[PDB]
Design a protein around this ligand. Structure first.
Ligand code: FES
Ligand code: K
Ligand code: K
Ligand code: MG
Ligand code: MG
Ligand code: MG
Ligand code: MG
Ligand code: MG
Ligand code: MG
Ligand code: MG
Ligand code: MG
Ligand code: MG
Ligand code: MG
Ligand code: MG
Ligand code: MG
Ligand code: MG
Ligand code: MG
Ligand code: MG
Ligand code: MG
Lengths: 122, 48, 72, 23, 74, 137, 128, 58, 86, 97
RNA sequence: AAACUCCAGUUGACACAAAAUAGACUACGAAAGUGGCUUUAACAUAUCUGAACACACAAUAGCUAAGACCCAAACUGGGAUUAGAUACCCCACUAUGCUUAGCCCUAAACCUCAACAGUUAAAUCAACAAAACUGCUCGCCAGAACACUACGAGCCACAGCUUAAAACUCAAAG
């Protein structure tokens, strides 16, 4: 089914970032994934210092890969991303747009619970 | 209707032929998912 | 009552009338009551659309000199 | 409720485990 | 207590009796001790308000029934 | 400008200066307020030790270290040694809820140092090591 | 199991899906779906083969077929997850519920009961 | 808003396990608690320590 | 350890008013639950004892919040006696 | 008979059900700006529904999104990102009084 | 007091341990249980009832084998207290809590309130507790103590578990 790879990349120059992005997309395709879109969220300071592959990273390039892969591909891709030294953090989730929000009428008021205790005179 | 919609989207899907071109286009572009909500329930998109 | 549907719509569109309700007078008619009466009179004419009938009711009151300031 | 019924059983069981250990 | 003055006047005007004050325990069921052995109890009790000041039935409603006195009540 | 309780962000540009020094350059006074002792170390903004004083180093022994007056005495001692090395403004970082949590800062002020900010850094595990068993008192 | 290229049960009968792009076909195939989608096709195949009316799912026969597909899925899960006690309970309960269904079917309709046993390869054993 | 009491207590209708186990019935009393005296604290500790400190010096 | 220092639980002193700053900081930690959490973390509270306390603290909130709602509802009637003498 | 007798209707004056500010809006873990609005500026603690004012469904969604964003390298844990300190206040909590 | 000073504070690197806030929510599961994040698989039954033993599960403790070491900690040692202190307080450190593979099958395993269906009418109803009842079915109980015992039998259990009496004694126990 449809997935989303939130790939935080190392702070590199454009040629190395392009090579890393292509390499990662090629790995997805090799595992049977139909890559749909690639989004650049920009390079920003990490929320906290992340130590990956014996390197301390304070900045990273946030990218998103929208793709369709078979369920078995996910585990294999996770293993590939772990071995890539240019990837700071990589997570695969079920694509959020596939999940449909149920229509909400609004907040229904709940009345005070009654008849909790008998009406005997204490 | 869903098959028809899907048949149109697949035209824009990344392929090995266009992979390099799509990677360069992504590097140039910027996508923002951040927006704020007011007390009135109105979305305040970012101004940047 | 059947007219409560009219009163609810009127109160939503225009709000509480500027004229203050005098509950001491048994025959006191409010702006909303006047609207209900005109609305009912136009229902006897044979208008079948509430929205059209509601619009026509307001126009008749405006012609009679009633002040109808909508919430907007 | 008080625990007087439990207390009788508590002493019986303790003495039993002590007797079994000894013998 | 908003109508204690009104009710006490109405009773005096029609030549009857009013009890708008705190109802002491035993006014009806222990009257012969409180008032005297030859005291005559009311023949009718009209409750203009049947609830006391804690929103519970006025004690005299129960006591009137004990003494077999008919009661009118709003 | 309205006073901002929020500290100036190191990256952004701020106009707030203390003796011509930015918030990121003010020396730090690390206070460890334990249940039985208070330890104060004044370090520079580059982590160079400048002064150290505890209730133990001021001559209080056993239960007398776990008192406000003992922590206040340590604060004054640390300020004196820090003021000799050129410290005026300090960023206080207190750790722990001991008896000398507030008294230690009063001592630092009584010693001639100016506190520009107070940070609480008491360690709170988010789930961590299981603490010692409850006491039967 | 059904081939992975098999189209999903929902999209198998939409007109013109035989002529869509190959990418669209595999996106709508079993390969790109979860395990539950393949189970639906399994049930469909059994319903058509054994049941007189595939559309009727409330018959005692359709319920047996549906339960047998579930039973097989639990056995496959338990093969990978041997110490999953929750699923082991679900399998044994499901087996006991199919035995009760089969007993009722044997008592009511023997001719159809025999066809269920043949198609689903179920051997009816009498309780101890 | 007051937290809900629907399904919180162990009752015949309630199928789930009890969320709450009040040791007293959850019923408002006709009284409130009495005013509590403040815990006494030693005063003028700082001023005493300045005078005593000077005594040591002099 | 990993996060940037001097951002969390940091309060700036206004006009050298350290007392007001400490009271503010202490109020922020109390409202968030850090002060009360630290005190409970000194000794390990066993699961059964933690469940018994949460149940107690929850029943106390419900009762205290309902008593307060009645006090504010009846405070209107603290007026002077209008029918004095009746 | 008589036409003035009350008739049976659903309350016409009944007001519409209230809605939380986030009702009908997708909550995303990538939308860190929105998520930051529901955490404490000083400690980063997630605010309860009594403070945030969200409905039970949206309170759960916000919580799960924060926890996800915080561990995936999108959101800080121990404090609120200073960049989002000037966003609209939507939480009923006062720290200075 | 002992202990520690190969100690303590700042900073950096840094788990086979445990999972603040959310949670004032009351959800999931047959129960036991389940509250960090992601993904995969996945939550029986179109009438109901239906096992101390058949079948499958079952907190914590414990057993067997192989690993892990932050912290906690039976036992043990030291310090203190005390008439004594085999405890309560302080310190140190084991088994054990963790993982893998097999056992063991117990709990105030109690929300001490069985499953399913239905009712709020009347005498509501000993007391207290969490108002009083109807239909139907299975399970269980008939003074206290002996007795979570003896014997027999079964069990990977061998200081064990399950089932479970009698004699003598009492006029109470509850
Ligand atoms: S009230 Fe609609 S989702 Fe919150
Ligand atoms: K956690
Ligand atoms: K219990
Ligand atoms: Mg005995
Ligand atoms: Mg009790
Ligand atoms: Mg010594
Ligand atoms: Mg909590
Ligand atoms: Mg059954
Ligand atoms: Mg039996
Ligand atoms: Mg077990
Ligand atoms: Mg073990
Ligand atoms: Mg230890
Ligand atoms: Mg060990
Ligand atoms: Mg339990
Ligand atoms: Mg029981
Ligand atoms: Mg049963
Ligand atoms: Mg036992
Ligand atoms: Mg035995
Ligand atoms: Mg034997």
């Amino acid at each position: 089914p449809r997935y989303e790879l939130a790939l935080i990349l190392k702070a590199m120059q454009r040629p190395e970032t392009a090579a890393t992005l292509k390499r990662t997309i090629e790995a997805l395709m090799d595992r049977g994934a139909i890559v749909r879109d690639l989004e650049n969220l920009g390079e920003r300071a990490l929320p906290y210092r992340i130590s990956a592959h014996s390197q301390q990273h304070n900045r990273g390039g946030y990218f998103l890969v929208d793709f369709y892969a078979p369920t078995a591909a996910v585990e294999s891709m996770v293993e590939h991303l772990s071995r890539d030294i240019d990837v700071i953090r990589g997570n695969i989730v079920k694509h959020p747009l596939t999940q449909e929000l149920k229509e909400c009428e609004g907040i229904v008021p709940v009345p005070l619970a009654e008849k909790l205790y008998s009406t005997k005179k204490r | 209707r869903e098959v028809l919609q899907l048949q149109e989207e697949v035209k824009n899907f990344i392929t090995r032929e266009n992979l390099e071109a799509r990677v360069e286009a992504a590097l140039d572009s910027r996508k923002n998912y951040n927006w704020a909500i007011t007390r009135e329930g109105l979305v305040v998109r970012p101004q940047r | 009552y059947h007219e409560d549907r009219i009163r609810a719509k009127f109160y939503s569109v225009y709000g509480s009338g500027q004229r203050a309700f005098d509950l001491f007078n048994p025959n006191f008619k409010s702006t909303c009551q006047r609207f209900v009466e005109k609305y009912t009179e136009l229902q006897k004419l044979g208008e079948t659309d509430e929205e059209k009938l509601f619009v026509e009711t307001g126009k008749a009151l405006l012609a009679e000199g009633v002040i109808l300031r909508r919430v907007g | 409720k008080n625990v007087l019924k439990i207390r009788r059983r508590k002493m019986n069981h303790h003495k039993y485990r002590k007797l079994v250990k000894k013998t | 207590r908003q109508f204690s003055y009104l009710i006490e006047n109405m009773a005096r005007d029609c030549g009857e009796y009013a009890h708008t004050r705190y109802f002491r325990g035993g006014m009806l069921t222990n009257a012969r001790l409180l008032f005297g052995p030859t005291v005559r109890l009311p023949d009718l009790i009209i409750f203009l308000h049947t609830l006391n000041n804690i929103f519970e039935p006025h004690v005299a409603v129960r006591d009137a029934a004990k003494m077999n006195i008919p009661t009118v009540g709003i | 400008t309205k006073f901002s309780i929020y500290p100036p962000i190191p990256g952004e540009e701020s106009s707030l200066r203390w003796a011509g020094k930015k918030f990121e350059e003010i020396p730090i006074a690390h206070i460890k307020a334990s249940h039985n002792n208070t330890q104060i170390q004044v370090v520079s903004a580059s982590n160079e030790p400048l002064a150290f004083a505890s209730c133990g180093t001021e001559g209080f022994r056993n239960a007398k270290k776990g008192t406000g007056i003992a922590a206040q005495t340590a604060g004054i001692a640390a300020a004196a040694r820090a003021k000799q090395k050129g410290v005026i403004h300090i960023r206080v970082v207190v750790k722990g809820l001991g008896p000398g949590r507030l008294s230690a800062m009063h001592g630092l002020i009584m010693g001639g140092l100016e506190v520009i900010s107070i940070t609480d850094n008491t360690p709170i595990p988010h789930x961590g090591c299981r603490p010692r068993k409850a006491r039967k008192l | 199991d059904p081939p992975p290229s098999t189209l999903l049960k929902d999209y198998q009968n939409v007109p013109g899906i035989e002529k869509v792009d190959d990418v669209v076909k595999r996106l709508l195939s079993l390969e790109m779906a979860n395990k539950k989608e393949m189970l639906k096709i399994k049930q469909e195949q059994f319903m058509k083969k054994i049941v007189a009316n595939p559309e009727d799912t409330r018959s005692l026969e359709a319920r047996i077929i549906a339960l047998s597909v579930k039973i097989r899925s639990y056995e496959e899960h338990l093969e990978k997850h041997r110490k999953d006690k929750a699923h082991k309970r679900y399998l044994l309960m499901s087996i006991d519920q199919r035995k009760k269904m089969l007993k009722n079917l044997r008592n009511t309709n023997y001719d159809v009961f025999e066809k269920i046993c043949w198609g689903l390869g179920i051997e009816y054993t009498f309780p101890p | 808003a007051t937290p809900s009491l629907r399904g919180r207590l162990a009752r015949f209708g309630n199928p789930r396990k009890p969320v709450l186990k009040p040791n007293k019935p959850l019923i408002l009393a006709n009284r409130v608690g009495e005013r509590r005296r403040e815990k006494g604290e030693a005063t003028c500790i700082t001023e005493m320590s300045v005078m005593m400190a000077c005594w040591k010096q002099n | 350890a990993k996060h940037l220092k001097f951002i969390a639980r940091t309060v700036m002193v206004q006009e050298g008013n350290v007392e007001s700053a400490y009271r503010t900081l202490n109020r922020i930690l109390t409202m968030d639950g850090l002060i009360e959490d630290i005190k409970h973390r000194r000794y390990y509270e066993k699961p059964c004892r933690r469940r018994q306390r949460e149940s107690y603290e929850r029943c106390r909130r419900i009762y205290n919040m309902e008593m307060a709602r009645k006090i504010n509802f009846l405070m209107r009637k603290n007026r002077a006696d209008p029918w004095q003498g009746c | 008979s008589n036409e003035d007798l009350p008739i049976s209707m659903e309350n016409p004056y009944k007001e519409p059900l209230k809605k939380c500010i986030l009702c009908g809006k997708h909550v995303d873990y990538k939308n860190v700006q929105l998520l930051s609005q529901f955490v404490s500026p000083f400690t980063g603690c997630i605010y309860g529904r009594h403070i945030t004012g969200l409905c039970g469904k949206k309170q759960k969604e916000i919580t799960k999104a924060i926890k996800r964003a915080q561990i995936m390298g999108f959101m800080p844990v121990t404090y609120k990102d200073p960049a989002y300190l000037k966003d609209p206040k939507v939480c009923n909590i006062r720290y200075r009084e």
